[PDB]
Symmetry: C3
Subunit: 139 residues, 3 copies
């Protein structure tokens, strides 16, 4: 298999790195690397970037998709606004998750909270060819 490198920033010291729960899992949970003893408030309708404290080194030919956690979405109405968030093999910034509160309650973000799931996949670049002149894709 391919290898996903992960560089831990200081605020991710002490957290478990992402890992697959079982051989059957599709994604890895990502955790909030916010300050200990700090509760971040996300009010209804509002969005924020939540740090993971991780830099991903995704190898050439692959991507990471940042997808929502299903339980947060149901219980709280929280999702990832840019879902599926695309992280490419060039990206060497810190991975941050863009949460939006689409529910009615104030939501509290805490250190260690599972905030998204990451799915690693091959990516391909087709040749792009201009040509001259039902299917899914229309509205």
């Amino acid at each position: 298999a391919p290898t996903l490198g992960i560089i831990r920033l200081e605020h991710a010291k002490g957290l478990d790195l992402p890992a697959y729960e079982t051989a059957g899992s599709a994604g890895m949970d990502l955790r909030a690397a916010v300050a200990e003893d700090r509760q971040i408030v996300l009010l209804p309708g509002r969005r924020t970037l939540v740090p993971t404290g991780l830099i991903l080194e995704i190898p050439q030919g692959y991507e990471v998709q940042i997808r929502p956690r299903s339980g947060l979405a149901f219980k709280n109405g929280i999702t990832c606004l840019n879902t599926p968030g695309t992280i490419d093999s060039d990206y060497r910034g810190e991975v941050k998750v863009l949460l939006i509160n689409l529910g009615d309650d104030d939501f509290r973000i805490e250190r260690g909270m599972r905030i998204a799931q990451a799915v690693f996949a091959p990516v391909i670049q087709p040749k792009i060819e201009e040509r001259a002149k039902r299917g899914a894709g229309g509205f």
Copy 2:
């Protein structure tokens, strides 16, 4: 090809199982297995789980992504809040679709309504390797 198993729960008796429309289709439409003669009201801003009455047996090495239907999104402002919803090869619960109404009208959910599309894909687990020290992925 791989085979996707589907176990039908009682409330899905009488509905067509998911199927690809053509050899070209990417997804399969999923239908609401709500009670006959019941109109479920989803008001603006609100979310709910819609039952499909299906248990998926996804084989090892594959996942299912639950994606929005484009026409509902356009016409009604309805989408899947946890999109793309990840269903892994361990999951043996009933598949439910988390709809949210991000439009202005009351939306009615009825038995048999197409509510999402399912895409079946291989999934890979890279080795996860901690390492020490523009690209898509930042904001």
Copy 3:
């Protein structure tokens, strides 16, 4: 590699076609092919279809996913409501992007603005087999 065909409609004359920035990129940016000298207003909570002026000829065995741009989502609260938007190999309509404003400001859509990213991927159709009787997928 596979080849993605692109037929340019009249309103896309003069725009750069989608292209990968680097060998590492996962997606291609898509641009608004709206009229020059026209600012389209997308108010908070509202959604609209934004034309690209492109018809995609995706080859059999592949799909295109229309995903949000991360910067628009962060800066403006704009996303693609039907994300990831599925375009299959049968679809020969114009590709339009369904933007929704989930922020607080009026958003202006202008000709040439990058409005989404397209990811090209293989797609598979498993055999669908009904069978009789934790994992990601529940809520």
